[PDB]
C-alpha cells in the first residue's frame, strides 16, 4: 500500500506537451528517469484508446487555463500501463504544470 504523497508526481511541459521537467517520484511508479522523458511529448506515452480523450483534454486546458484530465493510461517503462489522472494548469502561455496521480498498479 502506498501513501498519497508517494503516488503523485509533478511534471512541467511546453505548450505542445513535451516534458520540460519531471520529479523523481515517477521512477518509483512508472520506471522512467526524468532525464529520459525530457523533450518527448506526453502523447507518446498515452494508451491508443485514450489518445482522442487526451487531445480533447489538452484543448480544454489551453482554452480554459486548467483541466482535470479524467482517467487515462500511461505506458510504463518496462511494459504495460498505469491508470492516472492529471490536474493541468497553464502558467502565463509559458508552460503547463501537471499534478499526476496514479490510480492503479501496473497492468
Amino acid at each position: 500500500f502506498k501513501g498519497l504523497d508517494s503516488k503523485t508526481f509533478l511534471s512541467e511541459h511546453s505548450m505542445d506537451m513535451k516534458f520540460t521537467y519531471c520529479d523523481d517520484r515517477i521512477t518509483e511508479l512508472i520506471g522512467y528517469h526524468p532525464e529520459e522523458l525530457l523533450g518527448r511529448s506526453a502523447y507518446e506515452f498515452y494508451h491508443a484508446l485514450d489518445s482522442e480523450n487526451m487531445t480533447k483534454s489538452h484543448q480544454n486546458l489551453c482554452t480554459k487555463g486548467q483541466v482535470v484530465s479524467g482517467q487515462y493510461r500511461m505506458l510504463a517503462k518496462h511494459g504495460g500501463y498505469v491508470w492516472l489522472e492529471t490536474q493541468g494548469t497553464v502558467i502565463y502561455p509559458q508552460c503547463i504544470m501537471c499534478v499526476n496521480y496514479v490510480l492503479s498498479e501496473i497492468e
Partner: protein, 109 residues
C-alpha cells in the same frame, strides 16, 4: 525564461524544490527546504507574499500570481513572478498544499 517549481505548505515552508533553483536563484534545494519562502523575500514584499499564500487556498485551484524580490545566493534582489495554485488529492481530505512556478522576470515597461 529561468524558472523552477516548488511545493509549500500553507504557511509558506518549502517542502519540495526542483533542482532548477540553482540556476534561478543560486541556492541548492537543500538550502531552501524547510525554510519559509518569506525568509528570502524583500521586506517591502513580505506581507504581500504572506497574503498571497493565504488567499490562494481560497481560490479553488485557480492560479494566483505574485511578483516579489527574492534574495539570491549572492545577496542580490531578483524580481520573481511566482504563479501558485492549491492541490489536494481528490480521493483524500488531506490539507491542501501549494504548487509554485517561480520565474525571474523583468521589472520594466
Amino acid at each position: 525564461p529561468t524558472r523552477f517549481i516548488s511545493r509549500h505548505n500553507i504557511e509558506g515552508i518549502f517542502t519540495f524544490v526542483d533542482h532548477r533553483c540553482v540556476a534561478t536563484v543560486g541556492y541548492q534545494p537543500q538550502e531552501l527546504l524547510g525554510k519559509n519562502i518569506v525568509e528570502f523575500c524583500h521586506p517591502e514584499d513580505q506581507q504581500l507574499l504572506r497574503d498571497s499564500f493565504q488567499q490562494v487556498v481560497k481560490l479553488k485551484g485557480q492560479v494566483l500570481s505574485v511578483m516579489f524580490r527574492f534574495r539570491s545566493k549572492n545577496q542580490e534582489w531578483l524580481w520573481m513572478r511566482t504563479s501558485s495554485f492549491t492541490f489536494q488529492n481528490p480521493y483524500s481530505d488531506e490539507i491542501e498544499y501549494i504548487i509554485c512556478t517561480n520565474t525571474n522576470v523583468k521589472n520594466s515597461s
